[model samples]
Target: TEFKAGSAKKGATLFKTRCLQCHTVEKGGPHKVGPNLHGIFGRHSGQAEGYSYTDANIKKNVLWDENNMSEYLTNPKKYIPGTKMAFGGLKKEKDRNDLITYLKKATE
Candidate 1:
């Protein structure tokens, strides 16, 4: 399924609450606990330079677009088993959409 857009405004709120602890979306932002997510919309996984990634992530050569990214957000571990990311799944569909919406631009 394709990932559709949602409210970026609300998504930003969700991003701050759920993702900011580990992620940074500013372009050229330093890697945090997680990799800096700048330009992530269409990139390959585990490509963030200087960040340590698990074997599962480096080997899981998925091109990150909206569709799969949404699934990853839903459950990071389930989507890419053995990945080092520890966030619990964002289970709410709307919330996921909102965050993805925010990320679409924030990570650009």
Candidate 2:
């Protein structure tokens, strides 16, 4: 489902608390355990410049749109089996929506 607009501010906080350990948000952001999330909304899966991705991710050929993002964030392992992302998932729908909202705002 398309998220009704969410709060980037709250999402920012959520991301910091939940995702900052593995992901980066800034342009030219250094790749950490996960690839930089700069400009990720419309990007293809596993296309970040130098970060290595699972063969599944590279071959999945999925675009990172809101629906896809929501699904993936809901269950990373289930969304793409064999994904290297060890994250179980953000279980709350609100949290996932907020994070996607923040990503659209920040990663634009």
Clashes of each: 0, 0
lDDT of 2 by residue, 36-80 (tens): 898988889989978889898988888988888988998888988
* lDDT per residue (tens digit) for residues 7-83 in model 1: 99999998899889998999979898988999997899989989989999989988988778888988989989989
TM-score of 2: 0.94
At residue 78, what lDDT does model 2 achieve? 91
Compared with the true structure, model 1 gives a TM-score of 0.95
What are the lDDT figures for the candidates, one per model? 0.88, 0.87
> Over the full model, what C-alpha lDDT does candidate 1 score relative to the true structure?
0.88
Q: Can you list the residue pairs that collide in candidate 2?
A: none
Clashing pairs in 1: none
RMSD per candidate (Å) reads 1.0, 1.1
Q: Candidate 1 vs. truth: CA RMSD?
A: 1.0
